[PDB]
Amino acid sequence: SKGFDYLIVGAGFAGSVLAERLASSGQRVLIVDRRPHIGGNAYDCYDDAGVLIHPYGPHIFHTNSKDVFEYLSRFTEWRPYQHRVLASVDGQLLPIPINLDTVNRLYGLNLTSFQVEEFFASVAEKVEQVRTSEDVVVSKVGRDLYNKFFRGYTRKQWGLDPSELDASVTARVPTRTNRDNRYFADTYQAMPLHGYTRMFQNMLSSPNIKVMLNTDYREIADFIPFQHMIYTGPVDAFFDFCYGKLPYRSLEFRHETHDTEQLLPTGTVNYPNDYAYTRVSEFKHITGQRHHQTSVVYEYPRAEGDPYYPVPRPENAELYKKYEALADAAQDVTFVGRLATYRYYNMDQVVAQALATFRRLQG
Amino acid sequence: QESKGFDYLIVGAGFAGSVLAERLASSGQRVLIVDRRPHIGGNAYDCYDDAGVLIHPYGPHIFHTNSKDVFEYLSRFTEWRPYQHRVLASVDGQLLPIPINLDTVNRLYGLNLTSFQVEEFFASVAEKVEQVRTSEDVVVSKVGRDLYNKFFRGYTRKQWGLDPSELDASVTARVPTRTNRDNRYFADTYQAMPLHGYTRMFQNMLSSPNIKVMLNTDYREIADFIPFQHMIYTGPVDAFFDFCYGKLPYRSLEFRHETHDTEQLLPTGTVNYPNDYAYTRVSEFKHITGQRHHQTSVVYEYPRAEGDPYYPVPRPENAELYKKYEALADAAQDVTFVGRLATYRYYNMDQVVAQALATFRRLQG
Numbered sequence: 193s194k195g196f197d198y199l200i201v202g203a204g205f206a207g208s209v210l211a212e213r214l215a216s217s218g219q220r221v222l223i224v225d226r227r228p229h230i231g232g233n234a235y236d237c238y239d240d241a242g243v244l245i246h247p248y249g250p251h252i253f254h255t256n257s258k259d260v261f262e263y264l265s266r267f268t269e270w271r272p273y274q275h276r277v278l279a280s281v282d283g284q285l286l287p288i289p290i291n292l293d294t295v296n297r298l299y300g301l302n303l304t305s306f307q308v309e310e311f312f313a314s315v316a317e318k319v320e321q322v323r324t325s326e327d328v329v330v331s332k333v334g335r336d337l338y339n340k341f342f343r344g345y346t347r348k349q350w351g352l353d354p355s356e357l358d359a360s361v362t363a364r365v366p367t368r369t370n371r372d373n374r375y376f377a378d379t380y381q382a383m384p385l386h387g388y389t390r391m392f393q394n395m396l397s398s399p400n401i402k403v404m405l406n407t408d409y410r411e412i413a414d415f416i417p418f419q420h421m422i423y424t425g426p427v428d429a430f431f432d433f434c435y436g437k438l439p440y441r442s443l444e445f446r447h448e449t450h451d452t453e454q455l456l457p458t459g460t461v462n463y464p465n466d467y468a469y470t471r472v473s474e475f476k477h478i479t480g481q482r483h484h485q486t487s488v489v490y491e492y493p494r495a496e497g498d499p500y501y502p503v504p505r506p507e508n509a510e511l512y513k514k515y516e517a518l519a520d521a522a523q524d525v526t527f528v529g530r531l532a533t534y535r536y537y538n539m540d541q542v543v544a545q546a547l548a549t550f551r552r553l554q555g
Numbered sequence: 556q557e558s559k560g561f562d563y564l565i566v567g568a569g570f571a572g573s574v575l576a577e578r579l580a581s582s583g584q585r586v587l588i589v590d591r592r593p594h595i596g597g598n599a600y601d602c603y604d605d606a607g608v609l610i611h612p613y614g615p616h617i618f619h620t621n622s623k624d625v626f627e628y629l630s631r632f633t634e635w636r637p638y639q640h641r642v643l644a645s646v647d648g649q650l651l652p653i654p655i656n657l658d659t660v661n662r663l664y665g666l667n668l669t670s671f672q673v674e675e676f677f678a679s680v681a682e683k684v685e686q687v688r689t690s691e692d693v694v695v696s697k698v699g700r701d702l703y704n705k706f707f708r709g710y711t712r713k714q715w716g717l718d719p720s721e722l723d724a725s726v727t728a729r730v731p732t733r734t735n736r737d738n739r740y741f742a743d744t745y746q747a748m749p750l751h752g753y754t755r756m757f758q759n760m761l762s763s764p765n766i767k768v769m770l771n772t773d774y775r776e777i778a779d780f781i782p783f784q785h786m787i788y789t790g791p792v793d794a795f796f797d798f799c800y801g802k803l804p805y806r807s808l809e810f811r812h813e814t815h816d817t818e819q820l821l822p823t824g825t826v827n828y829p830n831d832y833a834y835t836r837v838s839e840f841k842h843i844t845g846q847r848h849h850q851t852s853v854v855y856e857y858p859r860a861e862g863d864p865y866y867p868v869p870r871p872e873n874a875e876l877y878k879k880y881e882a883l884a885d886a887a888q889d890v891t892f893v894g895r896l897a898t899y900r901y902y903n904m905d906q907v908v909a910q911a912l913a914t915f916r917r918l919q920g
């Protein structure tokens with residue numbers, strides 16, 4: 193071989209799906225990551241005690257797309273799992289998303305599904321145009337439930353009030369009149385049976401894929417031959433922050449192991465109103481691993497650190513537009529992924545995006 | 556005229572490559588380390604299996620050394636679980652200590668020798684050999700022909716596809732005969748396993764910012780276009796020189812992994828089978844790792860003539876062939892050869908580490 197058809201930057205879902213697709217169509221692919229491991233944020237591994245964990249926070253796979261689910265199925269088997277989260281509020285562990293039981297338990301009511309609908313209507317606030325993260329919630333369940341479940345959590349997570357964020361943020365967590373307590377109502381809910389990393393290895397295993405780790409693309413870009421680049425990192429950095437830093441929100445993770453089989457009643461407990469952390473997660477709930485000990489992770493929001501979240505709001509959408517135009521003009525570069533196109537995407541969404549990009553590149 | 560690129564391209568991420576990658580990196584050299592396998596660690600790589608048991612995909616690796624410096628060097632990259640490996644040989648339907656010792660002899664023949672008598676006993680069955688050269692010679696001249704047939708001949712024939720008469724003495728000489736009651740497989744000063752396994756240790760070794768790690772990559776797919784100033788090669792020597800003198804024999808293995816629904820399958824880390832079955836041995840990883848788990852994973856090793864090279868085959872016809880490749884190696888301007896495969900040496904892990912450290916001091920001189 194004398195070079196590569198593609199240099200792919202980042203070995204998370206965005207990069208790896210494209211690597212898999214290009215390589216299976218005959219292309220020579222070099223995939224690179226500044227991190228010492230593949231998988232990006234979805235990387236998993238065994239900790240010191242032998243528990244399978246997610247070093248970058250709990251990643252629960254879920255999708256409504258049959259195509260996405262069947263695509264991933266090529267690379268892993270599944271453990272069925274429907275994630276459930278409780279919120280700590282007024283000293284109780286209550287379902288989030290808010291549902292019938294959340295409301296009845298919180299206030300000691302005995303409303304039926306039909307009645308809880310009118311109760312919501314009786315407390316809701318009228319908003320002419322729903323635009324912010326405050327609007328979406330307050331206009332649906334009213335001020336008190338907003339205060340109890342969203343305001344505090346949102347401020348802690350983003351360093352911003354919900355009125356300061358686009359509606360699309362808090363609207364991720366739909367409110368319900370029914371008694372569904374799953375965090376997701378997606379059609380397909382399941383975890384890679386032996387974890388994500390195993391899945392990524394299968395994904396990246398073709399002979400046409402060379403993997404370079406612990407490596408910034410800029411370190412090798414001058415002297416490795418390649419026709420096209422797929423970039424999945426932060427956009428602002430790609431253009432040397434020429435228009436200023438595009439805000440991304442970060443996280444610090446405090447992992448702990450405990451000498452019992454179970455610490456929590458569910459996979460994740462949220463803390464809208466207490467503590468420095470937004471939530472704790474316990475991995476055995478998610479992986480189904482059996483073990484005599486247990487490992488959990490506490491997440492603390494951070495203004496600095498590796499970028500994990502775009503911050504959806506008008507001034508950032510605007511700043512992003514500028515970077516987007518440089519991106520659109522970059523000739524032999526395709527931008528794809530949560531960080532690179534500045535979209536608050538779920539794993540399955542990134543997969544679909546990568547798949548659609550491959551089709552265009554081909555197709 | 557062209558990009559100088561990396562100071563060193565290192566082929567293979569086993570002990571040989573990784574130790575040199577770490578040393579060169581710490582001195583400020585830019586390193587690209589490549590392996591055709593999809594993981595680091597060479598033969599010593601370990602990982603958790605489908606059941607969550609820590610295993611060694613390429614057979615049991617027990618760390619042991621007499622070198623305090625090798626032990627301390629590695630200690631920079633891992634903590635340790637103390638462990639002294641013990642092997643039992645299946646002979647006459649009993650599980651007996653190998654290396655052969657006092658208890659082995661007493662139990663096998665129904666004797667009651669003391670340590671002072673078993674020496675005299677050995678003396679009385681030993682065959683003399685004016686010059687020891689063969690793997691047959693080393694054994695038969697110390698413990699005689701019956702003990703040789705029971706513990707060594709069959710195992711050796713099965714492992715190498717050669718009779719011990721066709722191997723250099725150094726192969727069977729690896730397993731000393733004892734007149735004491737020591738049942739450890741090794742008597743080395745430092746015996747201990749990387750607390751969280753080899754892979755974790757290797758990851759720490761290759762963590763430097765000056766180290767770029769390329770997996771799933773034959774160096775040959777890369778060497779035409781990636782600029783490097785010097786090469787460190789740790790693969791088989793014959794292949795490097797396009798088998799221009801014919802195939803250098805390396806012995807291979809096939810591994811069959813199993814997980815059983817019990818806490819413990821075997822009484823020790825490894826049971827050898829000199830006289831039974833197609834496999835040479837079974838090993839049970841929890842003995843070696845100290846891992847706690849409600850199931851257990853084991854591996855059976857089948858000797859293969861064909862496949863990835865794991866052992867040089869020490870005997871005169873092969874040392875002959877290697878000598879020729881070695882002259883080519885010594886002459887190759889910007890390439891240095893290191894490790895079990897590249898220098899055709901039947902080395903344990905610690906010896907490869909020592910080789911790599913010594914090569915580093917030479918490069919730096």
Ligand SMILES: Cc1cc2nc3c(=O)[nH]c(=O)nc-3n(C[C@H](O)[C@H](O)[C@H](O)COP(=O)(O)OP(=O)(O)OC[C@H]3O[C@@H](n4cnc5c(N)ncnc54)[C@H](O)[C@@H]3O)c2cc1C
Nearest residue numbers: 202204205206226232233249251252409425529530538539
């Ligand atoms: C705490 C947390 C929980 C989450 N939970 C879920 C969940 O439960 N369910 C769900 O569906 N999704 C979840 N996600 C989101 C999910 O992680 C994303 O969809 C996923 O990250 C998308 O992958 P990606 O390829 O776009 O980016 P990434 O995973 O971030 O990968 C991009 C890669 O690019 C690399 N890179 C950047 N710059 C360079 C450079 N210069 N050189 C080399 N490499 C570079 C990075 O190191 C990175 O690994 C969660 C995310 C977080 C942070």
Ligand SMILES: Cc1cc2nc3c(=O)[nH]c(=O)nc-3n(C[C@H](O)[C@H](O)[C@H](O)COP(=O)(O)OP(=O)(O)OC[C@H]3O[C@@H](n4cnc5c(N)ncnc54)[C@H](O)[C@@H]3O)c2cc1C
Nearest residue numbers: 567569570571591597598614617773774790894895903904
């Ligand atoms: C079954 C078995 C059991 C063992 N048990 C013990 C033990 O108990 N105790 C002990 O001390 N030692 C043990 N060893 C010995 C130990 O494996 C070796 O000393 C050590 O692993 C060798 O290190 P290395 O770097 O020299 O070679 P390797 O581990 O073999 O690594 C060389 C690397 O180079 C790579 N390579 C080769 N060609 C290319 C190419 N062209 N392109 C890219 N990469 C290439 C290979 O993939 C390989 O990973 C055992 C060995 C085996 C096989």
Ligand SMILES: O=c1ccn([C@@H]2O[C@H](COP(=O)(O)OP(=O)(O)O[C@H]3O[C@H](CO)[C@H](O)[C@H](O)[C@H]3O)[C@@H](O)[C@H]2O)c(=O)[nH]1
Nearest residue numbers: 250252279288341342343345346349361362364365462464
């Ligand atoms: O109890 C809550 C939960 C959410 N929110 C608000 O709604 C937003 C979106 O909530 P997410 O649960 O989607 O937050 P994350 O992205 O940080 O969490 C990640 O891990 C979660 C646990 O699985 C979910 O899967 C989620 O989809 C996944 O992206 C939060 O930022 C916040 O503004 C709350 O105010 N209170």
Ligand SMILES: O=c1ccn([C@@H]2O[C@H](COP(=O)(O)OP(=O)(O)O[C@H]3O[C@H](CO)[C@H](O)[C@H](O)[C@H]3O)[C@@H](O)[C@H]2O)c(=O)[nH]1
Nearest residue numbers: 615617644653706707708710711714726727729730825827
């Ligand atoms: O029961 C035996 C043991 C050894 N031998 C002979 O002596 C040789 C060298 O024996 P090794 O035990 O060193 O064989 P290995 O290199 O294959 O074993 C590897 O795996 C082992 C784990 O059980 C030990 O850690 C050993 O040191 C490690 O290099 C064998 O090839 C064979 O010729 C026997 O004939 N019979």
